[PDB]
Amino acid sequence: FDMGGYFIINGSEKVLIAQERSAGNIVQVFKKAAPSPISHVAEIRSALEKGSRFISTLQVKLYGREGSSARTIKATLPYIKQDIPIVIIFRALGIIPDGEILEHICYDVNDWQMLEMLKPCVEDGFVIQDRETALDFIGRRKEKRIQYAKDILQKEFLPHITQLEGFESRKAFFLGYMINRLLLCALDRKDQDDRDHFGKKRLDLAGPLLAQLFKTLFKKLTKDIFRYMQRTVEELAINAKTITSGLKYALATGNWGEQKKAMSSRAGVSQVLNRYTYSSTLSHLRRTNTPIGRDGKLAKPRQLHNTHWGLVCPAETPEGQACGLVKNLSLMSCISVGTDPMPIITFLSEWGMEPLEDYVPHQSPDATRVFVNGVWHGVHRNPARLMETLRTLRRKGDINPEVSMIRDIREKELKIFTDAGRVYRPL
Amino acid sequence: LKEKAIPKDQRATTPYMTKYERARILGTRALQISMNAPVFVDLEGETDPLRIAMKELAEKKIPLVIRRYLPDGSFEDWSVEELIVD
Amino acid sequence: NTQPTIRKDGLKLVGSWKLRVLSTEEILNIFKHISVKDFTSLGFNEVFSRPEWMILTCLPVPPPPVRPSRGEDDLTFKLADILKANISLETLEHNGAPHHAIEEAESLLQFHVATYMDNDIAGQPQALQKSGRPVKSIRARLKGKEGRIRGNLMGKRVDFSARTVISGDPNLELDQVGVPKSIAKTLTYPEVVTPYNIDRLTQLV
Amino acid sequence: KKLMAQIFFGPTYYQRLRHMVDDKIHARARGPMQVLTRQPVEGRSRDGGLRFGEMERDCMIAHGAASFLKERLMEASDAFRVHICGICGLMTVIAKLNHNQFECKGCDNKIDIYQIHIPYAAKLLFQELMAMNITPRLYTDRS
Amino acid sequence: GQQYSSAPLRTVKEVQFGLFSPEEVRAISVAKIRFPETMDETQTRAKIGGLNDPRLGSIDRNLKCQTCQEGMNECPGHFGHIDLAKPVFHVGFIAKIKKVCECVCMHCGK
Amino acid sequence: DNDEKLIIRCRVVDHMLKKIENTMLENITLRGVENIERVVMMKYDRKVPSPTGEYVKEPEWVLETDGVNLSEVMTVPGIDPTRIYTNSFIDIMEVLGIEAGRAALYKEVYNVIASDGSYVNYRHMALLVDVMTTQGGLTSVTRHGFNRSNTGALMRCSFEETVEILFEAGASAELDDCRGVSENVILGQMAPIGTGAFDVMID
Amino acid sequence: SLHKMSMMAHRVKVIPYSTFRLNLSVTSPYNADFDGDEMNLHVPQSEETRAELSQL
Amino acid sequence: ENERNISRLWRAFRTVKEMVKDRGYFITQEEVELPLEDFKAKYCDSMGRPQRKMMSFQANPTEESISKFPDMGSLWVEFCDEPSVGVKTMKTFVIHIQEKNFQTGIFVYQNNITPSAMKLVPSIPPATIETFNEAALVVNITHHELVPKHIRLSSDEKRELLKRYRLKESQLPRIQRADPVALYLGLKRGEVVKIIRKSETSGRYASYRICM
Amino acid sequence: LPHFSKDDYSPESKGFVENSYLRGLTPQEFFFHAMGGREGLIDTAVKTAETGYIQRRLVKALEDIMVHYDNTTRNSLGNVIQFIYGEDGMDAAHIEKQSLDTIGGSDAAFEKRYRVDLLNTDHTLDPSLLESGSEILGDLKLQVLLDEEYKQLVKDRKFLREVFVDGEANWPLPVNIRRIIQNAQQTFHIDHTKPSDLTIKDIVLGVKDLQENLLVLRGKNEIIQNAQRDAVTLFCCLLRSRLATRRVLQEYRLTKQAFDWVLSNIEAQFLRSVVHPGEM
RNA sequence: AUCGAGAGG
DNA sequence: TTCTCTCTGGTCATGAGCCTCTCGAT
DNA sequence: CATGACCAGAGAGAA
Ligand SMILES: [Mg+2]
Ligand SMILES: [Zn+2]
Ligand SMILES: [Zn+2]
Numbered sequence A: 001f002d003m004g005g006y007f008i009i010n011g012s013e014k015v016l017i018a019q020e021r022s023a024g025n026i027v028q029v030f031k032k033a034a035p036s037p038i039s040h041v042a043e044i045r046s047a048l049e050k051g052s053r054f055i056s057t058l059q060v061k062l063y064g065r066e067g068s069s070a071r072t073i074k075a076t077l078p079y080i081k082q083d084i085p086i087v088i089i090f091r092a093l094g095i096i097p098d099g100e101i102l103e104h105i106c107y108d109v110n111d112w113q114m115l116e117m118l119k120p121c122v123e124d125g126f127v128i129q130d131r132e133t134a135l136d137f138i139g140r141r142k143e144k145r146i147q148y149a150k151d152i153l154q155k156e157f158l159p160h161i162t163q164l165e166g167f168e169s170r171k172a173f174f175l176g177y178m179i180n181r182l183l184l185c186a187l188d189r190k191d192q193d194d195r196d197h198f199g200k201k202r203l204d205l206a207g208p209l210l211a212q213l214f215k216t217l218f219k220k221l222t223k224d225i226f227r228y229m230q231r232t233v234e235e236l237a238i239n240a241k242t243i244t245s246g247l248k249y250a251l252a253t254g255n256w257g258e259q260k261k262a263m264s265s266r267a268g269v270s271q272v273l274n275r276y277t278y279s280s281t282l283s284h285l286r287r288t289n290t291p292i293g294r295d296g297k298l299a300k301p302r303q304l305h306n307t308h309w310g311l312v313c314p315a316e317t318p319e320g321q322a323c324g325l326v327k328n329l330s331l332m333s334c335i336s337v338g339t340d341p342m343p344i345i346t347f348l349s350e351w352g353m354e355p356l357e358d359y360v361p362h363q364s365p366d367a368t369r370v371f372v373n374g375v376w377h378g379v380h381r382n383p384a385r386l387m388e389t390l391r392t393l394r395r396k397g398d399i400n401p402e403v404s405m406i407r408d409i410r411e412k413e414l415k416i417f418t419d420a421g422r423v424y425r426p427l
Numbered sequence B: 001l002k003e004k005a006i007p008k009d010q011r012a013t014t015p016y017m018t019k020y021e022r023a024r025i026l027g028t029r030a031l032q033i034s035m036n037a038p039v040f041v042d043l044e045g046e047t048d049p050l051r052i053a054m055k056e057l058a059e060k061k062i063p064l065v066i067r068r069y070l071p072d073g074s075f076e077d078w079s080v081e082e083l084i085v086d
Numbered sequence C: 001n002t003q004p005t006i007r008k009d010g011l012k013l014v015g016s017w018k019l020r021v022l023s024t025e026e027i028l029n030i031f032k033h034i035s036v037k038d039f040t041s042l043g044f045n046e047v048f049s050r051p052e053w054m055i056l057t058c059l060p061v062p063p064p065p066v067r068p069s070r071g072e073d074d075l076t077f078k079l080a081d082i083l084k085a086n087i088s089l090e091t092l093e094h095n096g097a098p099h100h101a102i103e104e105a106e107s108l109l110q111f112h113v114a115t116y117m118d119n120d121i122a123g124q125p126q127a128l129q130k131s132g133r134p135v136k137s138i139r140a141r142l143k144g145k146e147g148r149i150r151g152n153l154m155g156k157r158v159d160f161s162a163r164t165v166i167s168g169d170p171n172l173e174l175d176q177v178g179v180p181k182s183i184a185k186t187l188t189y190p191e192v193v194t195p196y197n198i199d200r201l202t203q204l205v
Numbered sequence D: 001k002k003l004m005a006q007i008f009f010g011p012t013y014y015q016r017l018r019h020m021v022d023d024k025i026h027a028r029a030r031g032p033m034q035v036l037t038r039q040p041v042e043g044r045s046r047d048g049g050l051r052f053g054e055m056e057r058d059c060m061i062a063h064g065a066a067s068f069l070k071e072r073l074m075e076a077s078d079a080f081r082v083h084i085c086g087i088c089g090l091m092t093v094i095a096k097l098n099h100n101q102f103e104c105k106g107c108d109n110k111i112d113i114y115q116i117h118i119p120y121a122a123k124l125l126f127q128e129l130m131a132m133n134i135t136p137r138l139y140t141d142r143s
Numbered sequence E: 001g002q003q004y005s006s007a008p009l010r011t012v013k014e015v016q017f018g019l020f021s022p023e024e025v026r027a028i029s030v031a032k033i034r035f036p037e038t039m040d041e042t043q044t045r046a047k048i049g050g051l052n053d054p055r056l057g058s059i060d061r062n063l064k065c066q067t068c069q070e071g072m073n074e075c076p077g078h079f080g081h082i083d084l085a086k087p088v089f090h091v092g093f094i095a096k097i098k099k100v101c102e103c104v105c106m107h108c109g110k
Numbered sequence F: 001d002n003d004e005k006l007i008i009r010c011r012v013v014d015h016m017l018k019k020i021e022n023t024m025l026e027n028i029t030l031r032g033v034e035n036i037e038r039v040v041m042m043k044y045d046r047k048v049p050s051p052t053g054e055y056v057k058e059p060e061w062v063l064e065t066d067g068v069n070l071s072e073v074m075t076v077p078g079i080d081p082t083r084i085y086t087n088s089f090i091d092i093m094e095v096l097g098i099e100a101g102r103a104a105l106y107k108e109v110y111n112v113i114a115s116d117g118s119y120v121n122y123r124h125m126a127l128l129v130d131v132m133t134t135q136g137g138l139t140s141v142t143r144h145g146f147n148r149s150n151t152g153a154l155m156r157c158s159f160e161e162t163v164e165i166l167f168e169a170g171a172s173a174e175l176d177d178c179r180g181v182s183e184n185v186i187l188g189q190m191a192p193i194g195t196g197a198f199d200v201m202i203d
Numbered sequence G: 001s002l003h004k005m006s007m008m009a010h011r012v013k014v015i016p017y018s019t020f021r022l023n024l025s026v027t028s029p030y031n032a033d034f035d036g037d038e039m040n041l042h043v044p045q046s047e048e049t050r051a052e053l054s055q056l
Numbered sequence H: 001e002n003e004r005n006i007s008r009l010w011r012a013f014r015t016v017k018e019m020v021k022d023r024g025y026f027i028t029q030e031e032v033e034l035p036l037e038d039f040k041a042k043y044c045d046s047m048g049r050p051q052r053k054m055m056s057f058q059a060n061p062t063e064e065s066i067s068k069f070p071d072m073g074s075l076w077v078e079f080c081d082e083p084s085v086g087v088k089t090m091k092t093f094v095i096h097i098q099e100k101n102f103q104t105g106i107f108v109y110q111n112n113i114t115p116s117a118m119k120l121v122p123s124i125p126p127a128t129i130e131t132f133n134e135a136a137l138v139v140n141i142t143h144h145e146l147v148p149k150h151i152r153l154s155s156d157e158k159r160e161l162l163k164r165y166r167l168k169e170s171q172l173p174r175i176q177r178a179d180p181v182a183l184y185l186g187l188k189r190g191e192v193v194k195i196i197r198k199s200e201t202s203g204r205y206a207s208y209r210i211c212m
Numbered sequence I: 001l002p003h004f005s006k007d008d009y010s011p012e013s014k015g016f017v018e019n020s021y022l023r024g025l026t027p028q029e030f031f032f033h034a035m036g037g038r039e040g041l042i043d044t045a046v047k048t049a050e051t052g053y054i055q056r057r058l059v060k061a062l063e064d065i066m067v068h069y070d071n072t073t074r075n076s077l078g079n080v081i082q083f084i085y086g087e088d089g090m091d092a093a094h095i096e097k098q099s100l101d102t103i104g105g106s107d108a109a110f111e112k113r114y115r116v117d118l119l120n121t122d123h124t125l126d127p128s129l130l131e132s133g134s135e136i137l138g139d140l141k142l143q144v145l146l147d148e149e150y151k152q153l154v155k156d157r158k159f160l161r162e163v164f165v166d167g168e169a170n171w172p173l174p175v176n177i178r179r180i181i182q183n184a185q186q187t188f189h190i191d192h193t194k195p196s197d198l199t200i201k202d203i204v205l206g207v208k209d210l211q212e213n214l215l216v217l218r219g220k221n222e223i224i225q226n227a228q229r230d231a232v233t234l235f236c237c238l239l240r241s242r243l244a245t246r247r248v249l250q251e252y253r254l255t256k257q258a259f260d261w262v263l264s265n266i267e268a269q270f271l272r273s274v275v276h277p278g279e280m
Numbered sequence J: 001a002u003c004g005a006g007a008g009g
Numbered sequence K: 001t002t003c004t005c006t007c008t009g010g011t012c013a014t015g016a017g018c019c020t021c022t023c024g025a026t
Numbered sequence L: 001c002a003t004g005a006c007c008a009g010a011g012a013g014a015a
């Protein structure tokens, strides 16, 4: 009757508790509080899936209160002190004319409201009217200034789109998309983004946790190897204890780190399997945590959200402190595991998706945007045909059945997710 | 200061014994009686120190004196004998 | 004389002065020559509290009962820290050390005394101890719900106590309480022997 | 005789849970005490004391039971007696009881000495303040 | 039990706070904590005169001290000192220190 | 008002017209009081003595606000300036004085308790609001409030910010009275509480 | 312990089994229930503190 | 269409008369309830405009007030038609008050007061001059439900108060010097006022506060 | 839920359980009900800690307040917080909600209930209620004391109507007169037929004496004597309304011994009801 | 001891 | 020009129900 | 977690 799913560390059975986080590379708009100088914000926490999983955070801030005039839009970029106005970014990405910029932001020329809201930004960066001077406007301690900006634009700005050079167009269009939804919220056209939708949440399971730990210690072993190489300049001295003892310490204590107390703040990640009854074990093997906090009157994360239906159990959660922050997976609920999007992207390009560089908004206005893992890859006209093809492929098996595909008709969007860690259920 | 007393004629605290001073009086006497100290009443078949103190209190043979303090530093002395118990 | 606009940094004080930093000897010998009257109008007492005593000249060691051990306290960890840093400054004194090695010795001697008094401070010099554990400071030791005041003075574990599961009984008096026999044999009242109880007391013994 | 009430009566799945008295029951008179604070140890498994928490201090205050309160905090937990100097009101005094000699180094005092009963946690507290450079002076009389 | 003491037992009625003068910590400390190490040298079965031995209190539960000859049950720990090579601040008073330094003239003492 | 479109035409006597427009839209008050963002008419079935003498229900129209400016609303015609009330007892303290403060503070505490059907005797909440107001104005029961008083030293540090109080006591050379109860429980002495509010001696 | 009524003096009745036992009409002041609740007992060691329990 | 301003000015006048009558000054009751038309008659000019330097009037202590405080006397209230009183408008007022040897002068103003004037307020050591604002005085705060009777104590009444409760000055409850009613009666620091208040438990209860 | 179409503000769509627990909830009702119950549990789980901290702060802020031996309510430094505890010096126990019967009712009913005119053949105490019933007509010297009593009753009613503006009559007060009167009726087996033996002077002068003997403070100076009369004002209102001549003689049928017993009882209970110095 | 985790009213 | 005046974001910072248990790595 | 005072800045009146 044993079900597996646990580890045996120094003799004791140990479980990994699914760590719940918010998904990366998804853009959300947040209204700001009543006394804030800034009115709304568009946020993306940009994550690189493969490689160093560092997270950049780009803010697009709409300055000015709801009754104030001179309402400007500025962006926050990872290594420059001041927010810089959006048109200066745009021209630093090679999009010089005001009209081209607005075309990147506003996808309908008959929306005089949004363009009227944009007027103060065109006035804000009227002083900067070539690409090179836009790159120059950068806070450092002369030519090296321009070079630092050029580097930042592809290195730390929108890292999830790409970090290779020459794709300023994709990042310009995506920045414009973020600005568009910012303004959509500011015009009372779309509502504030709900941060407690389960779809925007991710469940780090045993695999990802072990992978995050293994990356860290493998690079420590690698650095040790390099140091032993340098030491032997003139004369297989690999320390397997590093990997072994590190994995064991994490699985034993539950502090997900290499001998760090508070730096590996996620603690209790690994706990002793409960063996009191069969069902106690079964349940403990499907527990989730949410570390966002342990103490406080956190009304909204603790409440059963509508989207929890079918994936998380309504009834089963602790009482008292950690009520609602500790969840239990429904019976048929499953968790995605990770899939190569590259085949999907190639098929999309092969079946109608025009790329973002060749996208010309005023020349194809009624055109569905196509996203794959929060990346705007291009545009598609006739999305009904493409969507039918994609669904028939997934159901045939030719597209991985855990990949998710949503056609938002009324906003002309198609979003495909090959993510790891999103809860799904059969139907 | 120096002899912050009060004359018995000019006394303004309750002539009744507070519950707290009855409790402390009874406790102190039951302590004195738990150690083999002389009892000044005829213990008619009673052995518990506390009930000895209570009976001594009913017949007002407990010779202690409360020193009630008023917040300035003055005090009124009050014999357990004169105190009303109710 | 013109006087500087003072500001914080770490745990030393620097002033714009319409430029440099202010030694501990600096501020302290300013503090020796202040007239007594300005002490007292500044809220200080000439006998117990003088601003020259805010600075630390020589540090009192607490005895082992404050810092007892099979193990070794963090307080003596940090006391040994302070002492070897101090004797290192003494050595660098005696050996005519360079111009800004004395600043490392000084700055960390003060860091160590600071962390020994109180460890949680802004600028986040965490001051972790053996086994990567943050040094428990005297401040943090007597602070908090489980700290010395709230935990061992305003409340404490006590003798002659008991605890267990409760249930109800239709047939006890309201002022009664049911004591299990095991508990009732575990707890004792001290009773001085007297003629009135001596027989039942001998029986009990 | 029949019950006038009829009764709801039938099978029903019941469960025996982990909490059972004989694993919870606990009682202690004058057991072992801690090293640092010299107050009772914590835990039924170590024959420990129950906590007289400050909420219970509150209740005992509201009741007015002053001496029972002082009892819980002193005789049932870490009472202690220290010798202090009559001028520098600090626990500095070197007292040998076998030879009846009390001294205060620095102050040069040998005749104005007092002894006082405080919690050992309190003696700790004052020693820790002294280690912290704060001088907690304790004097017998108001002045 | 803590034997009998000739010292009169009174109660505490006043607590006068203040700060430690250097001179008084000199005058109260029965030992110069010169050496950091707890244990006596060569890792022996003893406590070194350097820090944690000298008559601050016993550590082997043996009735020896500075003019106490009392067990650990009866000995309140005795204080010592360490001369710092050059003055250093107090954390809890940095704020206060700067504030008083905030406005008092460097040259004149008022 | 007859014309079915309501239009206003304004010329100056071009970008500064937008500034005149912003000033107009945001910072011109047509009517009303500076902070009163909403007002509602309700009926209250108040009881008042009849000419015969026995009390009777005489319902009255009352206006309930959605904001507070006590000073300016109170000075308005048609209202009863003696009966005005706000649930912002701190505005009451500022305009009508500390004692009016005390009264409104008690009213609001009483209302939070009675809202739940509970009842607590007058004297307990009375003592609470008395201690909060016995100083100049409004002292709160949190670390900024009662705990920065002249309340000795040790009692003070038994609540919050422990070691900082102790340090300030060192520096300012505070003298502790040791008549506070927390002081005596710290020294294991009998506190001047009901049993120890007096001495005993013999005849 | 939110009440002065959370701590009350009782008369001891030594009884066989492993639980503390009390009368139903004392549950309300304690907010007691018999669903797993535990309770704590303290014993005076002086004559006058005995008195303080019994008289207050 | 500014009989609004007329009525508000008149109500401030009624309340200042009520204040100085309540402070222990000889003001008639028939005098204070002057109806609005009579106010217009006396102090509105030929333009219907009210000019409020004619409003200013000298109040004298009652007989009882010199029985209980011999040194109360010579108060003259001055209204100002110059809005936003500047420091040298107060110059005007302060040296008016000093020249005639007046113990207390109350200076009602309109809309505003410069801080430069505020500093020269305690200029003359014996004389005391108090600054008010019409918008405050349009309503008599002491008429309000939640405001019970404050009664300034004489010096000997405060000494008796202290002796019979065996009190220290610091043990007494406190009233803020700028407390609205403390201002309405011109409370000076150290002066005690006794407050008679309705009581849910005893019907009448008397508290005491001292000025800080 | 994804089982509903968009823009559906229906009862069942937005969380109305039309089913009872007996019949059973449907899946959507189950989930919506779970959504509500979770909010309940979290409200529980944090209100617990918030009220624990609130109680802690209340206690540590008030912990030093105690009734002193002059009944002032003070603190550690002796600062006065209340000059008399609870504004009436009474212990919060032995205090019961009794009604003040001169509040409320018509003035017609009021005077029918408490007015007696020995100078009016229709409004004097009938001889069925008093041994001195028919000597009592005329007698301006007894009508002066009765007029004094009635005038006080009137002053009390206006005072009480201006304290409790709503006209509320029942308030917590130290001595339950109602039960003392029933105790008197039972002890002495009053038969409600034979007339009393109380002189009008008996009742009137006795009630006034009783008001004199209701001490809460005892210093013999005018400050504290006025404090004393302030403390007992409400209670003396209740007392006068309860022990008024027509009431004692016609509603109750107290003999002189039962009435004197009522007086001694009220005194005894009252002085018991004072707070004890040392009370925390 | 220390850090942490689960649980009980 | 001086001086006193308002007067707000980056901070640093506070506690955060009581017990009570048991376990488990360093 | 999350609610909020203290400067430190800089715009901002008066004589
Ligand atoms: Mg329960
Ligand atoms: Zn000394
Ligand atoms: Zn010793």
Ligand SMILES: [Zn+2]
Pocket: C001, E105, E106, E107, E108, E109
């Ligand atoms: Zn100088």
